[PDB]
Amino acid sequence: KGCWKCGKEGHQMKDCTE
Numbered sequence: 417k418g419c420w421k422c423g424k425e426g427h428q429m430k431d432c433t434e
């Protein structure tokens with residue numbers, strides 16, 4: 417499990433403004 421936007425496994429998909 418991780419981010420469904422960029423994929424980086426660390427932050428979820430709420431603070432993915434990077």
Ligand SMILES: [Zn+2]
Binds near residue numbers: 420429
């Ligand atoms: Zn992300």
